């Protein structure tokens, strides 16, 4: 720690502003929307849909969210200064992982339900996707994350570090990215120390492989859209 | 959604 205490406190605030500005929905609104849950008739409605139809809807939502994650990255203090090769490399590797974190963030542990298209619904809502092993692992990851009770600032700093990771293969300016990552670790480390929550990152499960799969499904649909019904 | 993966991020980054 050569950086002065006041400078790091600002970096925390700047990163949080970027996360809040770029969420699809404010967390506070999400908690207030927990009362309305899809009705059993609405749920069956979703289950009636064809595998392709439910994947086509879910994949569009993953891509919409990715777009908001790219905006998050733009707001990071040093992201724009990086060469476009590096900007793209970091987003390919990490942007889906952030997405899963942001969508799993809109979850309610009391009744095991997720905010989805305007109302909260349970795991049963997704039966049409037909990948129950993937859907149950994703709901687990969400339940574990809820137990840890990340604040908006803790979730903003952690997602920031996911994107700004200097070990991705294909980075031209490796040293420049390490400098940007280190500054975020300094910031985040300080914030955990002040709140006595240093241990929380260890307890978070790895979502990398889950996101790898989600990206594979998103890609699957774009490669094969000519074989399915037109938009 | 025709654009996906790296193609959507490239389009998204131009701004
Ligand atoms: C329960 O855990 C899940 C996580 C993801 C999903 C999920 C989605 C979601 N599409 C939205 C579209 C939406 O409502 N956007 C507004 C939200 C976005 C997040 O921030 C708050 C406003 C929410 S979920 C799409 N695909 N999947 C997979 C199952 C393939 C992964 C399901 C379930």
Author numbering:
A (entry chain A): 263 to 493
B (entry chain B): 2346 to 2360
Quote from the publication.
We expected that elucidating the complex structure with compound T would be instructive for designing synthetic inhibitors due to a different chemotype from compound A. Therefore, the ternary complex of RORγ-LBD with compound T and CoR peptide was determined at 2.6 Å resolution. As no crystals grew under the previous reservoir conditions for the RORγ-LBD, rockogenin crystals were soaked with compound T and CoR peptide. Extensive interactions of compound T with RORγ-LBD include a direct hydrogen-bonding and van der Waals (VdW) contacts. O atom in the amide group of compound T accepts a hydrogen-bonding from backbone N atom of Glu379. An amide group of compound T orientates towards the opening of the ligand binding pocket with tert-butyl-pyrazole group lying in the hydrophobic residues lining the pocket. Compound T is found to reduce efficacy in the FRET-based CoR recruitment assay. This ternary complex structure reveals the structural mechanism for the decreased CoR recruitment activity of RORγ in the presence of compound T when compared to compound A. The complex structure shows that the binding of compound T induces a movement of helix 5 (H5) that resulted in a decreased interaction interface between CoR peptide and the binding groove of RORγ-LBD. The observed N-terminus region upstream from Glu2351 is unwound and Leu2350 backbone shifts approximately 2 Å outwards from RORγ-LBD. Ile2354 and Leu2358 interact hydrophobically with RORγ-LBD, but Leu2350 does not. Compound T induces the dislocated N-terminus of CoR peptide in a binding mode that will induce less interaction with hRORγ-LBD than that with compound A.
Retinoic acid-related orphan receptor gamma (RORγ) is a key transcription factor and a master regulator of the differentiation of Th17 cells and the cytokine production. T helper 17 (Th17) cells, which are a subset of CD4+ cells differentiated from naïve T cells, produces proinflammatory cytokines including interleukin 17 (IL-17). Th17 cells and the cytokine production play a pivotal role in autoimmune disease pathology in psoriasis, inflammatory bowel disease, rheumatoid arthritis and multiple sclerosis. Orally available small-molecule inhibitors of RORγ have been created as a substitute medication for injectable biologics, which impose burdens to patients.
